[PDB]
Design a protein around this ligand. Sequence first.
Ligand SMILES: CCCCCCC/C=C\CCCCCC(=O)OC[C@@H](O)CO
Ligand SMILES: CCCCCCC/C=C\CCCCCC(=O)OC[C@@H](O)CO
Ligand SMILES: CCCCCCC/C=C\CCCCCC(=O)OC[C@@H](O)CO
Ligand SMILES: CCCCCCC/C=C\CCCCCC(=O)OC[C@@H](O)CO
Ligand SMILES: CCCCCCC/C=C\CCCCCC(=O)OC[C@@H](O)CO
Ligand SMILES: CCCCCCC/C=C\CCCCCC(=O)OC[C@@H](O)CO
Ligand SMILES: CCCCCCC/C=C\CCCCCC(=O)OC[C@H](O)CO
Ligand SMILES: CCCCCCC/C=C\CCCCCC(=O)OC[C@H](O)CO
Ligand SMILES: CCCCCCC/C=C\CCCCCC(=O)OC[C@H](O)CO
Ligand SMILES: CCCCCCC/C=C\CCCCCC(=O)OC[C@H](O)CO
Ligand SMILES: CCCCCCC/C=C\CCCCCC(=O)OC[C@H](O)CO
Ligand SMILES: CCCCCCC/C=C\CCCCCC(=O)OC[C@H](O)CO
Ligand SMILES: CCCCCCC/C=C\CCCCCC(=O)OC[C@H](O)CO
Ligand SMILES: CCCCCCC/C=C\CCCCCC(=O)OC[C@H](O)CO
Lengths: 116, 93, 98
Amino acid sequence: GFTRIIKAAGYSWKGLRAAWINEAAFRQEGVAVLLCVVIAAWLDVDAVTRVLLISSVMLVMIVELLNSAIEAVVDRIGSEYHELSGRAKDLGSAAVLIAIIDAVITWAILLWSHFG
Amino acid sequence: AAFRQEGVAVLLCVVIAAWLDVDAVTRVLLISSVMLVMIVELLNSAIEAVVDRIGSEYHELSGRAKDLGSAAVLIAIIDAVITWAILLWSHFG
Amino acid sequence: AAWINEAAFRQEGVAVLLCVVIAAWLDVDAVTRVLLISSVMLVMIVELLNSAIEAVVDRIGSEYHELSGRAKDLGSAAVLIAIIDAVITWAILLWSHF
Ligand SMILES: CCCCCCC/C=C\CCCCCC(=O)OC[C@@H](O)CO
Ligand SMILES: CCCCCCC/C=C\CCCCCC(=O)OC[C@@H](O)CO
Ligand SMILES: CCCCCCC/C=C\CCCCCC(=O)OC[C@@H](O)CO
Ligand SMILES: CCCCCCC/C=C\CCCCCC(=O)OC[C@@H](O)CO
Ligand SMILES: CCCCCCC/C=C\CCCCCC(=O)OC[C@@H](O)CO
Ligand SMILES: CCCCCCC/C=C\CCCCCC(=O)OC[C@@H](O)CO
Ligand SMILES: CCCCCCC/C=C\CCCCCC(=O)OC[C@H](O)CO
Ligand SMILES: CCCCCCC/C=C\CCCCCC(=O)OC[C@H](O)CO
Ligand SMILES: CCCCCCC/C=C\CCCCCC(=O)OC[C@H](O)CO
Ligand SMILES: CCCCCCC/C=C\CCCCCC(=O)OC[C@H](O)CO
Ligand SMILES: CCCCCCC/C=C\CCCCCC(=O)OC[C@H](O)CO
Ligand SMILES: CCCCCCC/C=C\CCCCCC(=O)OC[C@H](O)CO
Ligand SMILES: CCCCCCC/C=C\CCCCCC(=O)OC[C@H](O)CO
Ligand SMILES: CCCCCCC/C=C\CCCCCC(=O)OC[C@H](O)CO
């Protein structure tokens, strides 16, 4: 049961590693998310505000990774132009963008509310 | 078609949240939970696009992929309903 | 349909379910309760999407491709981030609660 955990953790690290190595944009996003978590962790806010600040940027990373898994599947099927290939990447990018706008807005609402 | 009725769904939820006199935290939760449903539906549709891209022939793993996807959407929606029920109950408590 | 039978989902699902039951009984304010519940729901959502990705990969066939491994690894990383987010959420909110 905890043999599945080890194996799964190993796959997870490989995914993070590959995402980091292969694109500057993912590394820069990773920097942004880590800076936000650190800032949230040190900010003088209540616990529920702290969790909202942290979990909104975490969600960006989650959807980013899920969208990148979709892209890899699409690219696996081939370099071919295909209507559903394009559509699959369009839907997934849209998801990523919603998560990001949500994080940004969540941060602006709460920090403005905090007035600091 | 079934895409913009979802856009109306969320805009209506945003209008309600705006209209209700709740604090910033409550409003973020109300709206986030609806936006998660949207994120999950889009990721699900992406997966369905990929499945249909491989072939429109039936295959156990194709059915499996779509049903797991749709189960994800259902959980997100249950999560939204729970969120709205709990926060409104507390607001009007 | 046929996936809820398997040991892997049964185990993941029961953990999430227990956490929701516990969150429902805790003496916490409303916003705290919502965050405890949706953080573990999110783990279940992401696990379900990860498995959906795995199924599409396996659907393509058994021949290994670098990008097939990558899709599964990336899906697994998302699950890990959702789980860390759940643990952080419960720790921050219930630290305050004891
Ligand atoms: C509480 C925050 C949890 C983390 C959320 C954001 C995580 C973002 C990226 C994860 C780090 C991946 C690092 C992989 C890595 O450093 O390998 C690269 C190395 O081989 C050469 O630089
Ligand atoms: C693409 C944008 C990503 C940028 C990531 C880093 C920026 C994140 C948040 C911006 C606000 C940071 C400054 C807030 C702050 O440190 O105030 C602390 C102050 O209240 C303590 O007295
Ligand atoms: C306060 C510092 C950042 C806060 C979040 C903690 C870091 C979480 C994830 C980042 C991965 C830790 C760094 C691992 C690393 O350096 O990579 C080693 C890599 O070369 C091995 O292949
Ligand atoms: C991988 C990185 C782990 C993520 C780190 C998240 C840590 C989050 C918060 C740490 C500090 C919380 C602030 C302490 C605090 O709330 O003090 C107020 C409390 O003592 C009042 O009773
Ligand atoms: C101030 C007056 C505003 C009038 C519009 C109010 C908003 C009305 C309805 C919002 C739509 C949400 C419905 C989605 C829902 O709850 O579950 C849908 C799901 O069960 C079916 O797939
Ligand atoms: C306030 C309670 C939670 C609100 C849920 C937020 C998400 C809103 C709508 C999700 C489902 C909308 C209905 C569309 C759907 O999934 O079923 C198809 C059918 O209803 C035709 O559109
Ligand atoms: C100071 C860090 C604060 C939070 C750390 C808590 C970490 C607790 C558990 C980490 C998760 C252990 C591995 C789980 C795992 O392998 O993921 C499942 C796969 O990724 C997909 O099925
Ligand atoms: C990546 C897409 C980003 C989209 C633009 C982000 C919009 C930024 C702020 C809009 C916030 C709406 C009002 C929120 C509020 O009450 O105060 C916000 C503060 O005045 C600004 O820090
Ligand atoms: C993760 C998504 C986060 C986005 C939700 C945060 C805010 C979203 C849209 C802004 C709508 C805010 C309306 C609140 C408002 O109208 O002001 C209340 C005043 O007291 C009366 O108008
Ligand atoms: C999309 C979810 C829709 C769920 C609707 C739940 C009911 C919401 C509000 C009930 C309205 C009836 C009472 C209205 C009220 O007393 O105050 C309304 C305030 O004037 C708004 O600022
Ligand atoms: C699906 C069947 C629908 C049945 C509708 C009738 C249900 C009657 C009452 C249910 C609402 C009770 C919620 C009250 C509650 O739990 O909140 C407590 C507050 O936090 C403190 O007042
Ligand atoms: C079939 C059950 C009804 C499902 C929809 C509502 C259930 C939502 C949460 C389950 C119970 C956990 C909440 C208990 C509760 O309402 O406590 C009061 C809140 O803290 C404030 O509203
Ligand atoms: C009391 C706070 C708990 C917060 C974290 C809730 C975790 C909920 C579910 C965790 C499920 C992790 C399993 C992930 C996975 O893919 O591996 C399955 C293995 O069988 C792990 O046992
Ligand atoms: C999966 C088993 C391991 C679980 C480890 C849970 C705790 C480890 C890391 C949690 C990260 C946050 C620490 C708690 C914390 O920040 O409390 C500070 C304040 O007292 C709460 O706001």
